[PDB]
Design a protein around this ligand. Structure first.
Ligand SMILES: C=CCn1c(=O)c2cnc(Nc3ccc(N4CCN(C)CC4)cc3)nc2n1-c1cccc([C@H](O)C(F)(F)F)n1
Ligand SMILES: [Cl-]
Length: 261
């Protein structure tokens, strides 16, 4: 197998119904990669779309400081494999779960940094006429040496002007997308990013439905247990505005005065 031949497994770092993700060292260069190994999806099925979106996303994207880098992908033995950059700090979900287990948080300075960096990743992706459509802390990865945030798990990436929408995590999903309005999808990434930062800031777990869910889509920010500048708060506020056209574009976001630096 090319997998065994080119790589040595070190550690299982992720798993799901699809299969697993392994931390591996490539024998030829001695570098660490995150390799996802999954059972070959049914040909034509939704999962085959997912797998295809991920590779054809790189076909357009390539390389960027705030997108998890792809190196290769292949299929063998009824499985598919994708070789990605290894981000040694895990996902923002791990970092948050580790903040809670151990009694920590993210300073306002750090929340802004998170917002700007993922913002730069979105700026790029949108500029390539694509949208990520599954922004959430578990799909934001962290490289340390001192931190770089990188957008990964491109399995939902689709076109701005010809969108095949498999709808993302309900907790981070904008209402217009649920309403089958796909005309401003870049602004759904912006909405999901806002709630991603809210999670990082220490908000209680986001609702999947119910009145709390609807109150958020009405433009009400989840409660943040720490004191943030009103300016920063308002930015997160407008980013989840019910009118997607009122939300800042990724460009406006990365150019925003409150995010200077
Ligand atoms: C290739 C697949 C997607 N992917 C990446 O491109 C990528 C890059 N860098 C890392 N770093 C990384 C993750 C986790 C950990 N852990 C977690 C905490 N644990 C106690 C042990 C250490 C350490 C370093 N990880 C990545 N990916 C990844 C790893 C696990 C799970 C999922 C996705 O949720 C899934 F859907 F693909 F499963 N993705
Ligand atoms: Cl939960």
């Amino acid at each position: 197998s090319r997998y065994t031949t080119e790589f040595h497994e070190l550690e299982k770092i992720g798993s799901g119904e699809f299969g697993s993700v392994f931390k591996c060292v490539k024998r030829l260069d001695g570098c660490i990669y995150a390799i996802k190994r999954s059972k070959k999806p049914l040909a034509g099925s939704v999962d085959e779309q997912n797998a295809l979106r991920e590779v054809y996303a790189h076909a357009v994207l390539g390389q960027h400081s705030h997108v998890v880098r792809y190196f290769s992908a292949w299929a063998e033995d009824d499985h598919m494999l994708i070789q990605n950059e290894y981000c040694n700090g895990g996902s923002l979900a791990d970092a948050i779960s580790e903040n809670y287990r151990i009694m920590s948080y993210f300073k306002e300075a750090e929340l802004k940094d998170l917002l700007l960096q993922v913002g730069r990743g979105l700026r790029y992706i949108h500029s390539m006429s694509l949208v990520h459509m599954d922004i959430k802390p578990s799909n934001i990865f962290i490289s340390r040496t001192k931190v770089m945030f990188k957008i990964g798990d491109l399995g939902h990436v689709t076109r701005i002007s010809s969108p095949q929408v498999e709808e993302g995590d309900s907790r981070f999903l904008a209402n217009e997308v649920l309403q089958e309005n796909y005309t401003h999808l870049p602004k759904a990434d912006i909405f999901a990013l806002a709630l991603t930062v809210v999670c990082a800031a220490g908000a209680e777990p986001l609702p999947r439905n119910g009145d709390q869910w609807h109150e958020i889509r009405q433009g009400r920010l989840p409660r943040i247990p720490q004191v943030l500048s009103q300016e920063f708060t308002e930015l997160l506020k407008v980013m989840i505005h019910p009118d997607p056209e009122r939300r800042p574009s990724a460009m406006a976001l990365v150019k925003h005065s409150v995010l200077l630096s």
